[PDB]
Write a protein that binds this ligand. Sequence first.
Ligand SMILES: Nc1nc2c(ncn2[C@@H]2O[C@H](COP(=O)(O)OP(=O)(O)O)[C@@H](O)[C@H]2O)c(=O)[nH]1
Ligand SMILES: Nc1nc2c(ncn2[C@@H]2O[C@H](COP(=O)(O)OP(=O)(O)O)[C@@H](O)[C@H]2O)c(=O)[nH]1
Ligand SMILES: CC(C)(CO)[C@@H](O)C(=O)NCCC(=O)O
Ligand SMILES: CC(C)(CO)[C@@H](O)C(=O)NCCC(=O)O
Ligand SMILES: [Cl-]
Ligand SMILES: [Cl-]
Lengths: 307, 307
Amino acid sequence: EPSPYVEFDRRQWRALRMSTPLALTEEELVGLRGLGEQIDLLEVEEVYLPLARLIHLQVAARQRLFAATAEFLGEPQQNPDRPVPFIIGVAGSVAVGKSTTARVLQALLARWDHHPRVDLVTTDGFLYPNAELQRRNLMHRKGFPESYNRRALMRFVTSVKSGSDYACAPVYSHLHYDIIPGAEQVVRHPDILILEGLNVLQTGPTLMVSDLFDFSLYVDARIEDIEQWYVSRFLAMRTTAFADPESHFHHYAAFSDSQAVVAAREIWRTINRPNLVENILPTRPRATLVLRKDADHSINRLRLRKL
Amino acid sequence: EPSPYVEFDRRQWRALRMSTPLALTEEELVGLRGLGEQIDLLEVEEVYLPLARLIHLQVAARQRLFAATAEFLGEPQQNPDRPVPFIIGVAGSVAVGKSTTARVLQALLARWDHHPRVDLVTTDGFLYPNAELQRRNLMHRKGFPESYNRRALMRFVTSVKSGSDYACAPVYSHLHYDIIPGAEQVVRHPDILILEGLNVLQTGPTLMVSDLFDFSLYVDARIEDIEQWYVSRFLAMRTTAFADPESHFHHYAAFSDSQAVVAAREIWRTINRPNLVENILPTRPRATLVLRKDADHSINRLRLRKL
Ligand SMILES: Nc1nc2c(ncn2[C@@H]2O[C@H](COP(=O)(O)OP(=O)(O)O)[C@@H](O)[C@H]2O)c(=O)[nH]1
Ligand SMILES: Nc1nc2c(ncn2[C@@H]2O[C@H](COP(=O)(O)OP(=O)(O)O)[C@@H](O)[C@H]2O)c(=O)[nH]1
Ligand SMILES: CC(C)(CO)[C@@H](O)C(=O)NCCC(=O)O
Ligand SMILES: CC(C)(CO)[C@@H](O)C(=O)NCCC(=O)O
Ligand SMILES: [Cl-]
Ligand SMILES: [Cl-]
């Protein structure tokens, strides 16, 4: 059977690095990794460097495509000191490390010849604020598609990709468990916009951000592994984030290893797992590149969309 | 508000024809038009010629894109006497003339310099045969997504776009109201494959043919107009197709103008309208170009996806 995909292992994949230079310290890599993420320079070299290359091959090529439409429309030539922004989506479960992957990718990409403006946005700030979620009865469905202002989100990316000079996104605080009053992220005609979130590859009766991506990643792992990473990160946060008296989950700091495992399993069981099964995992087939991770967080397989 | 779309009227649109030669007789145009379709050489010149141009601009450009992936993968160069096939989808309601649009487009495209192999396939032959539909309780939902062998359909297009030498599709008879035993359409590594059907722009938990399109059309009209075209074509078929004694709807031949209007309204009311509202119309936002038709079948507006 022919297939739109081709599978790789890490051997096959690292060969595709070719000449691509590594522009990252261990000290710089440190500052990009999230709690519980195990990435080192080797993983960057073998996994993230081929990837960065592929994307650069595609930016050039995907531009020829918009130029072709603008030529058809008898339009101005388009100054190359502001092309049409390349949009990259990053998806996958809570606790799977989307965050680290997107920051690493941003950093690699910004160290290209152009020195291109590479911005990074998470869909967190497009959550409805708590008071609106309370209203909609969705305080226990944060992360589900309906807990987002999808329209506001779509307006943002559309705004950016259509060549606007600036666009604003709201800002989410994990510590305070809500949207931050008055806070804005300002994206100014970047060259590349990475958009990171659970459900960014969703599709629907209306045009959505997944329709605007020129390239997508889905970070994947076995569901039980991800649960383990999630529970595990929950116990760890008892001495990082939960330890803050301002933390909306400061009550959790005091929990025993065992009470905390019970709490975290319950959250997984009722929110994050159902969302992964029902909404996120069904988006995996569309992703340009799936990064498969083994129980130790290691990316050891990849699935590339050839078609 | 910025928009992924740009609207045209026919004036704006016909300007975009530029130099593009017209290679069609009135006698050739005649043989491509379906019962009730009103297209003339003027419509071809003003509407179909810009369109054909846009597509040619895109074929070149979309090839640069697959070449970029193959370059990344360190693959052979790809002989230009067989690139990766350009796939065009054509969608819209029953009775809206998808058929005519796709045949016209095929004909225009095959009269390009390459003299390219342009094949045309409708999703009709991917219906389940009656006996299987009876089984699934779907004899009154022909045309709904679930009345198709979607997997078989996906296998077909995947097969073609992945460079296979040949792929087979089954064949549907309207006259006999069923799949034709033993009949095959054989598509042999075309340059361009046009895939025409109601639901070809649908999207879902699995990778679908809409994910393989490099360009799509959606032929649109006001729903009441389409009903009128449908009822109207039904009365007309009383002396064309229904007149055949072999016709599965030969009983309809004898109906009065008025009994027939009642029959056709009922079919619209119970099958074709619900499907248009529930499944087809929700796919319009993704289409590259929507062709809007006025009550006289005339394309007078267009919506192009810029993003
Ligand atoms: N303060 C706080 N931070 C959290 C919590 N959960 C996640 N985060 C932070 O949010 C970031 C996003 O985590 P998550 O949504 O699971 O996405 P991931 O990047 O795919 O692991 C992580 O780097 C965590 O540091 C939490 O419960 N409290
Ligand atoms: N024999 C027969 N042909 C039909 C019937 N309905 C549609 N057709 C043919 O099927 C072709 C497809 O029609 P339709 O499915 O409405 O698609 P359209 O091309 O968008 O109008 C048309 O050209 C008709 O000639 C029918 O009831 N009997
Ligand atoms: C992606 C976010 C930031 C939002 O869902 C996720 O990490 C989160 O906040 N989850 C918490 C789910 C809950 O406890 O309401
Ligand atoms: C697209 C097809 C050919 C199949 O739905 C359509 O024109 C059709 O056959 N409609 C008939 C619906 C019905 O009477 O069962
Ligand atoms: Cl999301
Ligand atoms: Cl279909």
